Amino acid sequence: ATNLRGVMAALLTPFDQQQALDKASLRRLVQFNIQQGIDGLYVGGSTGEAFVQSLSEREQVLEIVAEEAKGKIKLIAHVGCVSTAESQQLAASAKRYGFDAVSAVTPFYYPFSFEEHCDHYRAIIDSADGLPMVVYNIPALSGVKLTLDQINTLVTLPGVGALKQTSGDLYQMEQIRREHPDLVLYNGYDEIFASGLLAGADGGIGSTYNIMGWRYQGIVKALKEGDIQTAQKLQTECNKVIDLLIKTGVFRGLKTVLHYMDVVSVPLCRKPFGPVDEKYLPELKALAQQLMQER
Amino acid sequence: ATNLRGVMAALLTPFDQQQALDKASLRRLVQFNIQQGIDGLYVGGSTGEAFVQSLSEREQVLEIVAEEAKGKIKLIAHVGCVSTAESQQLAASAKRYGFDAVSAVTPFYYPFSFEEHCDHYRAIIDSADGLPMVVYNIPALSGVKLTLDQINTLVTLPGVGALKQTSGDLYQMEQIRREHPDLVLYNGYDEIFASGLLAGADGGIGSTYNIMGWRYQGIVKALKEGDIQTAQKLQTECNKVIDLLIKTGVFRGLKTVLHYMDVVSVPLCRKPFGPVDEKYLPELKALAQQLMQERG
Amino acid sequence: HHHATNLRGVMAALLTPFDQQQALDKASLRRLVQFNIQQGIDGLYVGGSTGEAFVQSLSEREQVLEIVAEEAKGKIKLIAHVGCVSTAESQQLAASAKRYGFDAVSAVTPFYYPFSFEEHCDHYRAIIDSADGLPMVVYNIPALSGVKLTLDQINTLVTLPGVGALKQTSGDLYQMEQIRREHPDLVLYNGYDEIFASGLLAGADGGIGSTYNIMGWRYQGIVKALKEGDIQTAQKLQTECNKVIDLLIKTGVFRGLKTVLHYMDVVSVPLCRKPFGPVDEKYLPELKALAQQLMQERG
Amino acid sequence: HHHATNLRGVMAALLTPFDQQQALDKASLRRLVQFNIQQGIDGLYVGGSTGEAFVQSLSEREQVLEIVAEEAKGKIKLIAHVGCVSTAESQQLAASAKRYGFDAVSAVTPFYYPFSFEEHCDHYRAIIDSADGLPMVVYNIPALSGVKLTLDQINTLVTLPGVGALKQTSGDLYQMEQIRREHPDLVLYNGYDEIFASGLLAGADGGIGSTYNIMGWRYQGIVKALKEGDIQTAQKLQTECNKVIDLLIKTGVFRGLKTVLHYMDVVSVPLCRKPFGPVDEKYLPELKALAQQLMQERG
Ligand SMILES: [Cl-]
Ligand SMILES: [Cl-]
Ligand SMILES: [Cl-]
Ligand SMILES: [Cl-]
């Protein structure tokens, strides 16, 4: 799955004032990401507010993104739901729309065993019908640090093409790379991107790529050139942003920056997310202006 | 909300081998719980496998349980989703079908503030159109211990009529009762029911009540009569069963017991839940036979 | 386990009074032992966490053990908490407990460094050997130790030869019941004072607690009320205990207790050792009012 | 922070050799000090967790401090970990560190009892006063201590008067970067050896680690490779360190390290103190083979 290697934005879902999909802003956001030189888009993930959308709504996003982006950048459909059948429906739809890959978060909420996770992934792969699968290692959600044997099991499942390493454990990052030298291994926490690459990730998937994807592409290139100072500098700038976004609320802060970038019409998330606290708007607008100047 | 007090079974949702809703087994389960002398049913909760069902399916179940049980026992609809809008849709449906109350788990997965949980409950309460609301204190999911002040804010939200205390912290159970003398306070962990009552809970909502609700009613009665020994003995028997169900998988183990009690046609949970390991079937069948004899 | 039957009951986890220079206040320590004997406490648990053992040297701990033995041997049951991280240090305290005439030893699961479960077992075996006949109380406090024993592991620990009891300092009352179910004759001490009534109901047959220093009689009252089937009295007593515990959590538990004991004319100077700070002066009125209230309910 | 810049670098967290009877092996201690110096290490961190401080008496820890200072003062930097639960005990060790001529002191956040943040700050202030001019290395540590500091709390700790450095025993490299961003001149030691390269990239300017005892030159290699922009050499070296760390985690880290040193003819007897058990015999060939491989990397 070498063709899945790279820096992929986890696409946000713009909503209108009534919390319905803002189709026009979705299309603007897809093109905005393409123009940033991003390798691909990760669509319908946690970042896309998948877990406050219906299946129909998730499919509509997939279809529109494919319309805008197919044959220009890589497209990975996050089809994960708690339910295997629901996840399967989305995988089949991803295949129809011509996505390059599917992905599923570890089924959550209820206590599922590792065996049940594996069967879940097998069924989704079947429904994906030739599309490779990106599986997760996400301890914050699962409540489990899986062993290296379990990871081997996961990443050697027939059809699995990559691992989204959504963990800040860079010893485990290095251990996974050592065990699987050819594995596509996405760094999941944007705020350790540079260090995650050094530890052995060969790319990433992240929410903040939407507004500053060129910075992350800059880190990749700097590290390839042995330019440690440039890499560090860029990560420091990314982290200044992540500091602010955690204060504001990450998705809504991102949408607001995009609103000031003239991409997103209405920067709301779906309830129960509240609006951005108005005291942060000047910082978010200033950030949008700073980012716009970096282009 | 005092009429919401008591022992409420968290109803399981029967499915068939296609993973479709088994409507005949659902009606049978509802009647079986009524015949156990249960005070009510808590429908479409986590226990009811809500989070692997669509809104429509949850509505179908709510409507059918209301058909079978409205007027005979108390009915609480769990309408909780991550999405407020979705929760409001189910709240409005619960009202239409004639439920006595609604309930919603803390919105999960994403990081939401306590203020955002409160606005979420307010929106659901509005859509429930006069039905009282049961809120949760569920640290295992929320990943936080709520201050007494936060609980105090929660239970005094307008329209909130009970707290589902899904915590094994019996110091906090007492603190809550001490602060809110008239609060309807449901013990959430079946395996500490007797001790939870002793600490201040005045009832419970439980998945295991589906197969042995009379034992939990028996603990209420024994504690009211000052019969500590019978209370302890019954809790011990419930915990022998809980030990087994934790090994088998709780929901599928319960459905399997009900299958052996001739209530549920097919004891499956929805994928990604797998089947019960067949080595446990003799124990589960033997347990069904023991429970049937207790009635007898 | 049946041979350990005489260890069943309500045991105060003794505090260690210090003077203004943070040295042992022997006169106050002797006072506190006698105060606890006069409350009709079944026994004393000496040199535990409550005693500030982990800010004491070995010699200081032996000194406390020897003094308490001088005051109380033969009058009430005495359990010596001998636990340190080091097994050799623990053994030295265990031998001393035997020399001074203690009825039992106890050890917290060795902490800080991750030790294997087999290493915990050998630690307990070594201490049991040095205790030379005195039975062992296994002391379980996941919240402070950071040691997370499984039920299987607990079952193995409590059946080690020479083990006569379990100090269960856990709020998990499902586990409490599971332990009782597996070991019908085991002496099973409830460790969190704020759930005492519920813990007894779940299957503890007594408790070891720091708050017993100032209101042991309330906890004995709960044991009696449950045994008689008087659930109302049991609940009411537990509620009063929890009102006190609410205050103590605000003030800091050890120092709040010593302050109450100061106002009861037991403890001269209610200091804990650094880095414990002093009680906030705004809480003194509440602490004095509690001392007065508690002195009243004895008649 | 700028005036304690000379503590920047790669500092081995010194192990404490014990003899067959588990008493201090002074001879082997002197030999381990010289072994570390000959590796080109910048300094030693003495009497930390790694040095088995928490299974030693105060006198034993002082004896170790005196011996190391004898062997190494003036040749490399020396940091005395003086941390105990007790402030007065930490102050004794701090006064001794000053007497033996150490360059800095350090103290783990006091553990077991749940101290407030203000209490932690006063504990450090008191130790800083007793160290009488030696700068303090503070801790940010949860996995071992159990103490869970916020970033704002870390920022207050590291700016206390007399604090010259932070030992960041955390795998959180976002926080590592945040700390560097807030404090440009702070000496910031990477605490987890297994992420050393990544930790330097995030902002650490050196480290303190147990595995430096057997392969310190590899970590100095990483520093140098990263300074020269040779990312592949850095990754390669970190990968080799991690293969060793994988084995040490299987064997038990301190005892595994001691066994490697025994095979390198640095340490006479590779025992840790009870309740640490011995290395399982089945790992000995791997440990001997590791010793030979490391001896070859410099011979
Ligand atoms: Cl995502
Ligand atoms: Cl439920
Ligand atoms: Cl104690
Ligand atoms: Cl150390």
Author numbering:
A (entry chain B): 2 to 296
B (entry chain C): 2 to 297
C (entry chain A), D (entry chain D): -1 to 297
From the publication, what sentences describe this entry?
In this report we present 11 diffraction data sets, in multiple space groups, from the E. coli enzyme N-acetyl-neuraminic acid lyase (NAL), which present twin lattices and incommensurate modulation. NAL crystallised in four different crystal forms from the same crystallisation conditions, and in the same drops (100 mM Tris-HCl pH 8.0–8.2, 200 mM Na acetate, 18–22% w/v PEG3350). The development of twin refinement in REFMAC, which at the time was only implemented in the experimental version of the program, allowed the determination of several apo- and ligand bound structures of NAL and the proposal of the first detailed mechanism of the enzyme reaction.
Interestingly, the three crystal forms in space group P21 were not related to each other, two of them were twinned and shared the same twinning operator, which made the monoclinic cells a pseudo-orthorombic cell. With the P21 indexing choice, POINTLESS initially assigned the space group C2221 but reflections belonging to one of the 2-fold axes were much stronger than the others (data not shown), which is consistent with pseudo-merohedral twinning in P21, and indeed with this choice the structures could be easily solved. Although they could all be solved by molecular replacement, they could not be refined satisfactorily using standard protocols. As a general rule, whenever only a single lattice with no incommensurate modulation was present, indexing, data reduction and molecular replacement were possible, but the (non-twin) refinement stalled at Rfactor and Rfree values of 30–35% for all datasets (resolution range 1.45–2.3 Å, <I/σ(I)> cut off = 2.0) where we would expect Rfactor values near or below 20% for well-behaved refinements. Refinement with the program REFMAC (versions 5.6 and 5.7) identified the twinning operator (−h, −k, h + l) for all the cases, in which twinning was detected. Twin refinement resulted in improved models with Rfactor and Rfree values ~18–20% (data collection and final refinement statistics are summarised in Table 1). Inspection of the packing using the molecular graphics program COOT25 highlighted how not only the inter-monomer contacts within the NAL tetramers were different, but also the inter-tetramer contacts in the crystal lattice. We speculate that the likelihood of NAL of crystallising in any one of the four forms is determined by small differences in the interfaces between tetramer during nucleation and the early stages of crystal growth.
